[PDB]
Design a protein around this ligand. Structure first.
Ligand SMILES: *[C@@H]1O[C@H](CO)[C@@H](O[C@@H]2O[C@H](CO)[C@@H](O)[C@H](O)[C@H]2NC(C)=O)[C@H](O)[C@H]1NC(C)=O
Lengths: 49, 110
């Protein structure tokens, strides 16, 4: 509060100082179960362009 | 790669007639920037390295009479021999050159 009002003494009242936010406890990833690699070999590396 | 099915394999046909050998690879071995079908027809008499018959699977090269004729497109190709002669008891092959690795035919012992 002292830093919000920029004073070393504060007067009786209610002051809004900051914001509360719950924090993420975990990180999850969901991707499809596709498995086969991709045919980049026969696109970049091919005889006849 | 490009695995080729060449039919038939055991041509036993009398002299003078026509005959035809078709080829069917898994891939459509063709090109459109140059409408040239990268594929060739070869033949071989026993005892010698084979001899080139048709390039671009259609066009005739010098020293080739009408006893050979190349045609085809897509992934189906035909070598047509109009008349037979006594020197043509030989093994015929198809061969791709569209993309490595190169492959040959199964053979055709006419
Ligand atoms: C065709 O193109 C690929 C790139 O998509 C190249 O990958 C090579 O793989 C071999 C084996 O590890 C290594 O020489 C290098 O990882 C790559 N070669 C390089 C960077 O020159 C390669 O040119 C071709 N792929 C294969 C299996 O030959």
């Amino acid at each position: 509060t002292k830093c919000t009002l920029k004073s070393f003494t504060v007067e009786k009242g209610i002051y809004q100082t900051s914001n509360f936010r719950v924090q993420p406890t975990e990180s999850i990833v969901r991707f499809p179960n596709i498995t086969n690699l991709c045919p980049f070999g026969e696109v970049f590396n091919a005889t006849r362009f | 790669d490009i695995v080729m099915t060449q039919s038939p394999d055991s041509l036993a046909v009398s002299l003078g007639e026509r005959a035809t050998i078709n080829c069917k690879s898994s891939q459509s071995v063709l090109y459109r920037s140059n409408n040239k079908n990268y594929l060739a027809w070869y033949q071989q008499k026993p005892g010698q390295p084979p001899k080139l018959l048709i390039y671009w699977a259609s066009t005739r090269e010098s020293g080739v009479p009408d006893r050979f004729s190349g045609s085809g497109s897509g992934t189906d190709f035909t070598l047509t021999i109009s008349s037979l002669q006594a020197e043509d008891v030989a093994v015929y092959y198809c061969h791709q050159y569209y993309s490595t690795p190169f492959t040959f035919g199964g053979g055709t012992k006419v």
